[PDB]
Amino acid sequence: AEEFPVPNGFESAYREVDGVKLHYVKGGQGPLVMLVHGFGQTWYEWHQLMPELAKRFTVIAPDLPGLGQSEPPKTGYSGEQVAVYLHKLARQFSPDRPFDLVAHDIGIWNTYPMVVKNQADIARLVYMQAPIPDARIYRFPAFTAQGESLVWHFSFFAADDRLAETLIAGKERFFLEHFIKSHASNTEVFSERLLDLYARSYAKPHSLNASFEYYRALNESVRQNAELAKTRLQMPTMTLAGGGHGGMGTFQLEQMKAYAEDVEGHVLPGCGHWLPEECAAPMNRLVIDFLSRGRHH
Amino acid sequence: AEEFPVPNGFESAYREVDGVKLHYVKGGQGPLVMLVHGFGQTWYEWHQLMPELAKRFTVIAPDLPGLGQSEPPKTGYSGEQVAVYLHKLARQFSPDRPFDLVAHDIGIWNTYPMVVKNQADIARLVYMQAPIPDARIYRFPAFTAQGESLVWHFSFFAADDRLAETLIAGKERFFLEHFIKSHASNTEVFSERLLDLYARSYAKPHSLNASFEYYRALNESVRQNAELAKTRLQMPTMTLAGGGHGGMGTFQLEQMKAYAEDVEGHVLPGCGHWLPEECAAPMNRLVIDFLSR
């Protein structure tokens, strides 16, 4: 069974990595690019970008441990632990050459440790729409002059007593529509049909729990990254952020400058958090162009 | 029947104020003291202070509009709108003399505008455990290195789509217990029976909604207070705050210094947000002494 339709010419498959069965969708030929999704979504957020990239690259889009059709991690949900699964998965398909990385939201959290610890394996890097876990996340406001703040969900999802699962179980479709649209500028792209697909996936009990375990490990990830960030990233990097409602704005690039020697950033106007869907044409163009500066098929 | 047991010597009663039927519990003789509860609770959070205060004062403890046994407001939930109801309720019982005011949590939000606009009516003021709505609330963090932050619930409760009511319905007791304990230092005061009583009250559908409409009006209250605060408070004021987990710490007094010319403050070590219950005896003593001197 497939939770989301696989694009023509791609394969849906699984690979055991350190005892954990990871789901991924793969296609194309050439150097490897791995695309890593974020909270509320699965590999499918990349499904419009993947066919274009696959004209030049081998493209792999995994489901994060516990999300989509991937089994939960056996070690833990901190960024350093999850990054091991993703690094090993990529190196199964690119064992002798560096690969490219694109990551969205908690995809960043779950890849930054393996990037900084294996810099020679990463040719080019694209990060969009979330802070790298560090002390900056403690400076975001709980409440703003407009209302809902961007990341009050950090506390909701991290709270003990399984607060978030207990309140959201049975209401997953309602909650995800609210979460997604409240973080969007171009809300109309989230049709009821698309929301149904995403909600069905993360309503699996182990996926609802896995979703929030990433946030329960967020302070551990911060502590990990305080050590790791003593080495700056040396490979070409690009950041993307939305400039509209739900977007990180200038924060994305300004934080990345503390992490990377070679970084260019873009803020996409009229786009919120969900760049692949809200602003597919300019986001796809920026990613394809940036990755095609390196050698490709 | 009554949602909470009434102390001996007090009466549970109702008064119509601007077409809204307000519930309150009243006892004692002497000058009037009005005690105003906050989120998650009702008049009952004052039930231990009320008999002691009633030895020297007439004491009235209303349910906020829409909460406890009080009808929802017919105007709105912003501080300036709600404060009219509470001001007129107090004036029904103390028309010829200024009265004292004690308020906890959103009781502050719901009384500050009538205090600042009717200063001759307010003899002494006690505020505990919540910011007055102003721009300072935009500086509290969404998340901390120890886990969930103190006031991320501001955003949760203010969200549209009836987010909070929809997620909490069917889980009202579970959520309230977590909310109370995550903002407490002393959790053992919250017996099963006490949690049951509070949960049953705010689980009434109009009370669950009313609870969060106070937060959906919070930015409006901030904007209102930006104009009202051009006039400083002149009556004797005391602030109380918990120094333990869930407490506001030094913030309570430091904010009040910007609002009030005559203010004293105390931080209670070992106490969290729910001062009348977590730290009943020292809180009661400090309030009684301040109002009695």
Side-chain angles (χ1 to χ4, degrees):
Chain A
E2 290 302 324
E3 293 182 331
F4 306 86
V6 173
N8 189 261
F10 283 70
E11 64 171 330
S12 166
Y14 299 82
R15 192 159 183 94
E16 287 281 333
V17 177
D18 291 347
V20 173
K21 188 190 308 301
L22 300 175
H23 175 245
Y24 62 90
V25 178
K26 174 174 176 302
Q29 274 191 295
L32 183 65
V33 54
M34 180 165 63
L35 318 175
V36 184
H37 72 86
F39 167 82
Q41 298 192 306
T42 64
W43 75 268
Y44 189 66
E45 67 160 302
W46 305 114
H47 81 274
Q48 304 183 74
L49 173 60
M50 287 159 68
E52 309 172 336
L53 275 179
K55 298 184 184 304
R56 298 167 169 175
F57 302 95
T58 302
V59 182
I60 185 173
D63 287 330
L64 287 170
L67 306 186
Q69 292 154 225
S70 288
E71 294 186 335
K74 281 175 166 51
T75 52
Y77 288 85
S78 69
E80 200 166 3
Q81 288 166 308
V82 175
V84 171
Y85 296 106
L86 298 179
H87 177 241
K88 291 191 175 178
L89 175 70
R91 291 294 275 181
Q92 299 303 284
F93 303 108
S94 189
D96 309 321
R97 288 176 156 100
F99 60 90
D100 296 333
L101 177 64
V102 183
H104 185 183
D105 186 68
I106 65 173
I108 295 171
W109 305 359
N110 291 314
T111 55
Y112 165 76
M114 67 101 165
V115 175
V116 70
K117 292 198 281 177
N118 309 278
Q119 294 210 37
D121 293 354
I122 309 300
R124 309 176 73 87
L125 177 75
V126 181
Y127 273 174
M128 64 185 81
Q129 276 297 132
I132 295 167
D134 66 23
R136 290 170 175 86
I137 72 175
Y138 308 133
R139 303 309 297 268
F140 283 88
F143 189 68
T144 73
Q146 329 299 329
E148 264 204 62
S149 68
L150 221 52
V151 297
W152 69 262
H153 67 271
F154 287 180
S155 277
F156 186 24
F157 295 171
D160 75 343
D161 295 327
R162 296 184 159 251
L163 178 71
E165 294 99 332
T166 304
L167 298 190
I168 292 170
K171 310 165 190 76
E172 305 88 350
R173 174 62 172 76
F174 163 81
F175 175 76
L176 192 63
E177 178 166 356
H178 175 84
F179 185 90
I180 290 184
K181 289 183 175 179
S182 71
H183 289 92
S185 181
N186 186 17
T187 63
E188 32 278 288
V189 306
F190 290 102
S191 67
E192 303 297 306
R193 173 180 208 264
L194 179 59
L195 292 166
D196 287 343
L197 290 171
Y198 282 130
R200 282 181 184 174
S201 180
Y202 100 125
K204 303 192 299 297
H206 74 256
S207 298
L208 186 65
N209 169 255
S211 296
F212 305 139
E213 291 300 324
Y214 286 103
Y215 297 80
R216 285 155 199 171
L218 178 58
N219 280 326
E220 176 175 11
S221 297
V222 168
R223 297 188 298 268
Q224 292 166 350
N225 293 346
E227 291 299 325
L228 295 180
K230 291 177 179 177
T231 308
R232 223 117 70 187
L233 301 180
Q234 311 289 326
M235 76 286 299
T237 311
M238 184 179 63
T239 62
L240 306 182
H245 188 91
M248 297 297 304
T250 56
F251 177 92
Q252 195 76 37
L253 174 58
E254 292 306 302
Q255 178 194 43
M256 195 70 179
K257 284 183 185 170
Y259 286 82
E261 301 285 4
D262 184 356
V263 56
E264 72 167 61
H266 303 271
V267 173
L268 285 62
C271 313
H273 178 69
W274 316 96
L275 299 183
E277 282 135 335
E278 293 183 57
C279 299
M283 192 215 75
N284 292 352
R285 179 82 277 156
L286 286 166
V287 171
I288 293 164
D289 288 346
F290 180 75
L291 296 183
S292 303
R293 299 183 203 169
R295 302 196 83 108
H296 53 268
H297 169 274
Chain B
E2 288 298 324
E3 286 186 338
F4 304 85
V6 181
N8 260 78
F10 285 69
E11 61 159 7
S12 165
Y14 302 78
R15 286 298 176 87
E16 281 281 330
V17 182
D18 290 350
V20 171
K21 185 192 291 189
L22 298 180
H23 175 244
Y24 60 89
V25 177
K26 175 177 175 297
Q29 319 174 238
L32 180 67
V33 183
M34 177 164 66
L35 314 176
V36 185
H37 72 89
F39 168 81
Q41 306 191 298
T42 61
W43 75 270
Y44 189 66
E45 73 160 294
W46 307 110
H47 81 270
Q48 303 181 75
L49 174 62
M50 283 159 72
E52 297 173 31
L53 218 40
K55 299 178 192 288
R56 309 168 176 177
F57 301 92
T58 304
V59 179
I60 184 173
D63 288 330
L64 286 173
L67 303 182
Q69 294 160 215
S70 287
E71 288 182 339
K74 287 177 177 64
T75 52
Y77 288 87
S78 70
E80 217 170 343
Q81 287 169 309
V82 176
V84 173
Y85 295 108
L86 300 179
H87 181 242
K88 293 188 173 188
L89 178 67
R91 288 305 277 182
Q92 288 188 15
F93 296 96
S94 184
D96 309 330
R97 180 158 187 182
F99 59 92
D100 296 333
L101 176 73
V102 182
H104 183 190
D105 188 69
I106 63 166
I108 294 166
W109 305 1
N110 289 317
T111 54
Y112 166 74
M114 69 103 175
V115 170
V116 68
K117 291 189 296 181
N118 304 280
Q119 298 205 30
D121 294 353
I122 307 299
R124 292 175 190 183
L125 176 69
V126 179
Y127 273 175
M128 66 186 75
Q129 273 300 130
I132 299 172
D134 64 25
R136 295 170 171 83
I137 68 171
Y138 308 134
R139 309 220 282 97
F140 286 92
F143 189 62
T144 80
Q146 292 83 29
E148 66 171 295
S149 69
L150 191 74
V151 299
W152 69 266
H153 68 272
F154 285 5
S155 281
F156 180 29
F157 295 173
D160 71 343
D161 292 331
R162 291 168 57 94
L163 179 64
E165 296 93 333
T166 301
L167 296 191
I168 292 167
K171 296 287 190 304
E172 302 89 349
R173 169 66 149 80
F174 168 82
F175 176 77
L176 186 59
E177 181 171 350
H178 176 90
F179 186 90
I180 284 168
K181 287 178 171 177
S182 66
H183 295 88
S185 293
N186 306 330
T187 60
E188 39 279 44
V189 287
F190 292 100
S191 67
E192 158 78 12
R193 175 172 189 253
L194 182 60
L195 289 172
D196 282 350
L197 292 175
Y198 283 134
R200 285 176 176 155
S201 178
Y202 100 123
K204 301 193 303 290
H206 74 263
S207 296
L208 188 64
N209 169 249
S211 293
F212 308 129
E213 292 295 333
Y214 287 105
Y215 295 81
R216 298 186 183 115
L218 176 54
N219 275 325
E220 186 177 0
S221 292
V222 169
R223 292 187 296 268
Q224 290 170 346
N225 292 351
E227 290 302 322
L228 299 172
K230 298 177 180 182
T231 302
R232 289 189 73 170
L233 298 177
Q234 301 298 332
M235 71 290 295
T237 302
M238 182 174 70
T239 62
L240 302 173
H245 181 74
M248 302 290 308
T250 61
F251 177 94
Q252 195 81 41
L253 170 61
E254 291 303 304
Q255 177 187 48
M256 194 69 193
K257 286 179 176 172
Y259 285 77
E261 292 282 350
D262 174 10
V263 57
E264 67 174 66
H266 306 283
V267 174
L268 285 68
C271 306
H273 175 67
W274 313 96
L275 294 186
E277 283 147 334
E278 294 183 54
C279 294
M283 192 214 73
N284 287 358
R285 171 56 31 208
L286 292 166
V287 170
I288 292 165
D289 283 348
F290 178 75
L291 297 182
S292 294
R293 89 169 62 114

mmCIF file of all heavy atoms in Angstrom, chain B residues 43-65:
data_model
loop_
_atom_site.group_PDB
_atom_site.id
_atom_site.type_symbol
_atom_site.label_atom_id
_atom_site.label_comp_id
_atom_site.label_asym_id
_atom_site.label_seq_id
_atom_site.Cartn_x
_atom_site.Cartn_y
_atom_site.Cartn_z
ATOM 1 N N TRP B 43 -15.170 31.734 41.460
ATOM 2 C CA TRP B 43 -15.143 32.379 42.772
ATOM 3 C C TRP B 43 -14.509 31.481 43.828
ATOM 4 O O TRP B 43 -13.940 31.976 44.810
ATOM 5 C CB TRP B 43 -16.573 32.752 43.208
ATOM 6 C CG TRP B 43 -17.371 31.538 43.650
ATOM 7 C CD1 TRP B 43 -18.163 30.733 42.861
ATOM 8 C CD2 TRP B 43 -17.406 30.970 44.965
ATOM 9 N NE1 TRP B 43 -18.697 29.710 43.620
ATOM 10 C CE2 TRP B 43 -18.246 29.835 44.911
ATOM 11 C CE3 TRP B 43 -16.817 31.318 46.190
ATOM 12 C CZ2 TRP B 43 -18.512 29.052 46.033
ATOM 13 C CZ3 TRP B 43 -17.078 30.533 47.299
ATOM 14 C CH2 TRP B 43 -17.917 29.412 47.214
ATOM 15 N N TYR B 44 -14.594 30.162 43.640
ATOM 16 C CA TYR B 44 -14.228 29.213 44.685
ATOM 17 C C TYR B 44 -12.750 29.254 45.044
ATOM 18 O O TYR B 44 -12.389 28.824 46.144
ATOM 19 C CB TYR B 44 -14.603 27.795 44.251
ATOM 20 C CG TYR B 44 -14.466 26.743 45.334
ATOM 21 C CD1 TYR B 44 -15.286 26.762 46.466
ATOM 22 C CD2 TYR B 44 -13.540 25.711 45.216
ATOM 23 C CE1 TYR B 44 -15.168 25.792 47.453
ATOM 24 C CE2 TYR B 44 -13.418 24.736 46.200
ATOM 25 C CZ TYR B 44 -14.235 24.780 47.312
ATOM 26 O OH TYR B 44 -14.122 23.812 48.288
ATOM 27 N N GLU B 45 -11.885 29.751 44.157
ATOM 28 C CA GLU B 45 -10.477 29.804 44.522
ATOM 29 C C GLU B 45 -10.258 30.711 45.726
ATOM 30 O O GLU B 45 -9.241 30.574 46.412
ATOM 31 C CB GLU B 45 -9.618 30.267 43.340
ATOM 32 C CG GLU B 45 -9.755 31.740 43.007
ATOM 33 C CD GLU B 45 -8.588 32.276 42.182
ATOM 34 O OE1 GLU B 45 -7.454 32.319 42.695
ATOM 35 O OE2 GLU B 45 -8.793 32.660 41.018
ATOM 36 N N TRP B 46 -11.206 31.600 46.021
ATOM 37 C CA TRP B 46 -11.113 32.480 47.177
ATOM 38 C C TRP B 46 -11.770 31.906 48.436
ATOM 39 O O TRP B 46 -11.834 32.607 49.451
ATOM 40 C CB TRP B 46 -11.744 33.839 46.850
ATOM 41 C CG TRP B 46 -11.199 34.477 45.618
ATOM 42 C CD1 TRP B 46 -11.848 34.652 44.416
ATOM 43 C CD2 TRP B 46 -9.887 35.028 45.449
ATOM 44 N NE1 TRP B 46 -11.009 35.281 43.519
ATOM 45 C CE2 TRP B 46 -9.805 35.525 44.127
ATOM 46 C CE3 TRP B 46 -8.775 35.153 46.288
ATOM 47 C CZ2 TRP B 46 -8.650 36.125 43.626
ATOM 48 C CZ3 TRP B 46 -7.629 35.762 45.792
ATOM 49 C CH2 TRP B 46 -7.569 36.234 44.481
ATOM 50 N N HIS B 47 -12.252 30.657 48.416
ATOM 51 C CA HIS B 47 -13.119 30.226 49.508
ATOM 52 C C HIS B 47 -12.391 30.112 50.842
ATOM 53 O O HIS B 47 -13.054 30.079 51.878
ATOM 54 C CB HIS B 47 -13.809 28.895 49.177
ATOM 55 C CG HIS B 47 -12.964 27.680 49.404
ATOM 56 N ND1 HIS B 47 -12.144 27.145 48.431
ATOM 57 C CD2 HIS B 47 -12.862 26.855 50.476
ATOM 58 C CE1 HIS B 47 -11.542 26.068 48.908
ATOM 59 N NE2 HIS B 47 -11.963 25.868 50.146
ATOM 60 N N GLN B 48 -11.060 30.052 50.848
ATOM 61 C CA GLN B 48 -10.328 30.012 52.109
ATOM 62 C C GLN B 48 -10.034 31.405 52.652
ATOM 63 O O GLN B 48 -10.064 31.607 53.872
ATOM 64 C CB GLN B 48 -9.012 29.257 51.933
ATOM 65 C CG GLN B 48 -9.176 27.856 51.412
ATOM 66 C CD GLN B 48 -7.848 27.169 51.285
ATOM 67 O OE1 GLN B 48 -7.249 26.765 52.288
ATOM 68 N NE2 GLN B 48 -7.357 27.060 50.062
ATOM 69 N N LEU B 49 -9.736 32.359 51.761
ATOM 70 C CA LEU B 49 -9.530 33.749 52.169
ATOM 71 C C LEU B 49 -10.833 34.399 52.617
ATOM 72 O O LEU B 49 -10.835 35.215 53.549
ATOM 73 C CB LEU B 49 -8.914 34.548 51.008
ATOM 74 C CG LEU B 49 -8.740 36.070 51.150
ATOM 75 C CD1 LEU B 49 -7.788 36.419 52.307
ATOM 76 C CD2 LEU B 49 -8.262 36.713 49.834
ATOM 77 N N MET B 50 -11.950 34.050 51.969
ATOM 78 C CA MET B 50 -13.204 34.768 52.209
ATOM 79 C C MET B 50 -13.631 34.778 53.674
ATOM 80 O O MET B 50 -13.964 35.862 54.184
ATOM 81 C CB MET B 50 -14.300 34.203 51.297
ATOM 82 C CG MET B 50 -14.177 34.687 49.862
ATOM 83 S SD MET B 50 -15.032 33.641 48.663
ATOM 84 C CE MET B 50 -16.739 34.053 49.058
ATOM 85 N N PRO B 51 -13.643 33.653 54.405
ATOM 86 C CA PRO B 51 -14.064 33.721 55.817
ATOM 87 C C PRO B 51 -13.152 34.572 56.684
ATOM 88 O O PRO B 51 -13.630 35.224 57.616
ATOM 89 C CB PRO B 51 -14.037 32.252 56.266
ATOM 90 C CG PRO B 51 -14.148 31.470 55.044
ATOM 91 C CD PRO B 51 -13.509 32.259 53.948
ATOM 92 N N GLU B 52 -11.844 34.568 56.424
ATOM 93 C CA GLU B 52 -10.950 35.416 57.208
ATOM 94 C C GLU B 52 -11.192 36.887 56.897
ATOM 95 O O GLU B 52 -11.297 37.723 57.803
ATOM 96 C CB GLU B 52 -9.492 35.035 56.940
ATOM 97 C CG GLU B 52 -9.118 33.622 57.364
ATOM 98 C CD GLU B 52 -7.710 33.226 56.935
ATOM 99 O OE1 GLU B 52 -6.834 34.110 56.861
ATOM 100 O OE2 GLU B 52 -7.479 32.027 56.668
ATOM 101 N N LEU B 53 -11.283 37.223 55.612
ATOM 102 C CA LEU B 53 -11.559 38.600 55.227
ATOM 103 C C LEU B 53 -12.908 39.074 55.755
ATOM 104 O O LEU B 53 -13.061 40.251 56.103
ATOM 105 C CB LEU B 53 -11.510 38.708 53.707
ATOM 106 C CG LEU B 53 -10.905 39.933 53.043
ATOM 107 C CD1 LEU B 53 -9.658 40.395 53.764
ATOM 108 C CD2 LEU B 53 -10.594 39.579 51.593
ATOM 109 N N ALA B 54 -13.890 38.173 55.836
ATOM 110 C CA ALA B 54 -15.231 38.551 56.270
ATOM 111 C C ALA B 54 -15.292 38.958 57.733
ATOM 112 O O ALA B 54 -16.337 39.444 58.179
ATOM 113 C CB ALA B 54 -16.215 37.409 56.018
ATOM 114 N N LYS B 55 -14.211 38.769 58.489
ATOM 115 C CA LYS B 55 -14.204 39.227 59.868
ATOM 116 C C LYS B 55 -14.144 40.744 59.964
ATOM 117 O O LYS B 55 -14.559 41.302 60.985
ATOM 118 C CB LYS B 55 -13.028 38.602 60.620
ATOM 119 C CG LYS B 55 -13.065 37.085 60.687
ATOM 120 C CD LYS B 55 -11.833 36.550 61.419
ATOM 121 C CE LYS B 55 -11.665 35.043 61.256
ATOM 122 N NZ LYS B 55 -12.665 34.267 62.034
ATOM 123 N N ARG B 56 -13.654 41.417 58.920
ATOM 124 C CA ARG B 56 -13.474 42.864 58.925
ATOM 125 C C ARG B 56 -14.081 43.563 57.717
ATOM 126 O O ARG B 56 -14.153 44.797 57.719
ATOM 127 C CB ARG B 56 -11.978 43.223 58.978
ATOM 128 C CG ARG B 56 -11.195 42.539 60.085
ATOM 129 C CD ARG B 56 -9.687 42.714 59.905
ATOM 130 N NE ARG B 56 -8.946 42.128 61.022
ATOM 131 C CZ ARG B 56 -7.620 42.080 61.112
ATOM 132 N NH1 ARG B 56 -6.862 42.579 60.148
ATOM 133 N NH2 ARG B 56 -7.050 41.524 62.173
ATOM 134 N N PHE B 57 -14.504 42.829 56.690
ATOM 135 C CA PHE B 57 -14.980 43.421 55.447
ATOM 136 C C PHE B 57 -16.239 42.704 54.991
ATOM 137 O O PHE B 57 -16.507 41.566 55.384
ATOM 138 C CB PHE B 57 -13.942 43.318 54.320
ATOM 139 C CG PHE B 57 -12.631 43.980 54.626
ATOM 140 C CD1 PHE B 57 -11.589 43.258 55.192
ATOM 141 C CD2 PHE B 57 -12.435 45.321 54.333
ATOM 142 C CE1 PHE B 57 -10.381 43.861 55.466
ATOM 143 C CE2 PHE B 57 -11.226 45.932 54.597
ATOM 144 C CZ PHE B 57 -10.196 45.203 55.174
ATOM 145 N N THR B 58 -17.027 43.394 54.171
ATOM 146 C CA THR B 58 -17.988 42.717 53.318
ATOM 147 C C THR B 58 -17.202 42.184 52.127
ATOM 148 O O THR B 58 -16.437 42.926 51.507
ATOM 149 C CB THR B 58 -19.097 43.673 52.852
ATOM 150 O OG1 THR B 58 -19.729 44.278 53.986
ATOM 151 C CG2 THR B 58 -20.151 42.920 52.034
ATOM 152 N N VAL B 59 -17.345 40.895 51.838
ATOM 153 C CA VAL B 59 -16.558 40.238 50.797
ATOM 154 C C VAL B 59 -17.500 39.765 49.701
ATOM 155 O O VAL B 59 -18.490 39.087 49.986
ATOM 156 C CB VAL B 59 -15.756 39.051 51.358
ATOM 157 C CG1 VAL B 59 -14.954 38.375 50.240
ATOM 158 C CG2 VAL B 59 -14.851 39.513 52.497
ATOM 159 N N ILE B 60 -17.187 40.101 48.451
ATOM 160 C CA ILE B 60 -17.934 39.576 47.314
ATOM 161 C C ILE B 60 -16.953 38.959 46.329
ATOM 162 O O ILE B 60 -15.931 39.572 45.991
ATOM 163 C CB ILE B 60 -18.794 40.656 46.625
ATOM 164 C CG1 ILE B 60 -19.633 40.033 45.515
ATOM 165 C CG2 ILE B 60 -17.940 41.783 46.056
ATOM 166 C CD1 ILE B 60 -20.639 40.988 44.904
ATOM 167 N N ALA B 61 -17.272 37.754 45.858
ATOM 168 C CA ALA B 61 -16.440 37.037 44.890
ATOM 169 C C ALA B 61 -17.300 36.641 43.695
ATOM 170 O O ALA B 61 -18.033 35.638 43.763
ATOM 171 C CB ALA B 61 -15.795 35.807 45.526
ATOM 172 N N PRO B 62 -17.248 37.397 42.601
ATOM 173 C CA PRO B 62 -18.062 37.062 41.428
ATOM 174 C C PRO B 62 -17.409 36.017 40.545
ATOM 175 O O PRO B 62 -16.183 35.889 40.485
ATOM 176 C CB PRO B 62 -18.162 38.398 40.682
ATOM 177 C CG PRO B 62 -16.835 39.059 41.006
ATOM 178 C CD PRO B 62 -16.586 38.707 42.457
ATOM 179 N N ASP B 63 -18.257 35.282 39.827
ATOM 180 C CA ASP B 63 -17.800 34.533 38.660
ATOM 181 C C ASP B 63 -17.681 35.487 37.473
ATOM 182 O O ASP B 63 -18.599 36.269 37.200
ATOM 183 C CB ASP B 63 -18.770 33.393 38.337
ATOM 184 C CG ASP B 63 -18.702 32.255 39.355
ATOM 185 O OD1 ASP B 63 -17.611 32.052 39.933
ATOM 186 O OD2 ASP B 63 -19.728 31.562 39.571
ATOM 187 N N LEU B 64 -16.543 35.427 36.780
ATOM 188 C CA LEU B 64 -16.356 36.210 35.568
ATOM 189 C C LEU B 64 -17.441 35.871 34.546
ATOM 190 O O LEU B 64 -17.922 34.735 34.504
ATOM 191 C CB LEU B 64 -14.983 35.930 34.961
ATOM 192 C CG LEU B 64 -13.799 36.557 35.704
ATOM 193 C CD1 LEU B 64 -12.486 36.058 35.096
ATOM 194 C CD2 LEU B 64 -13.891 38.088 35.636
ATOM 195 N N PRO B 65 -17.838 36.835 33.714
ATOM 196 C CA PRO B 65 -18.841 36.562 32.678
ATOM 197 C C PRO B 65 -18.523 35.319 31.856
ATOM 198 O O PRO B 65 -17.404 35.128 31.378
ATOM 199 C CB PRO B 65 -18.807 37.832 31.829
ATOM 200 C CG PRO B 65 -18.558 38.916 32.865
ATOM 201 C CD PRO B 65 -17.509 38.274 33.783
#
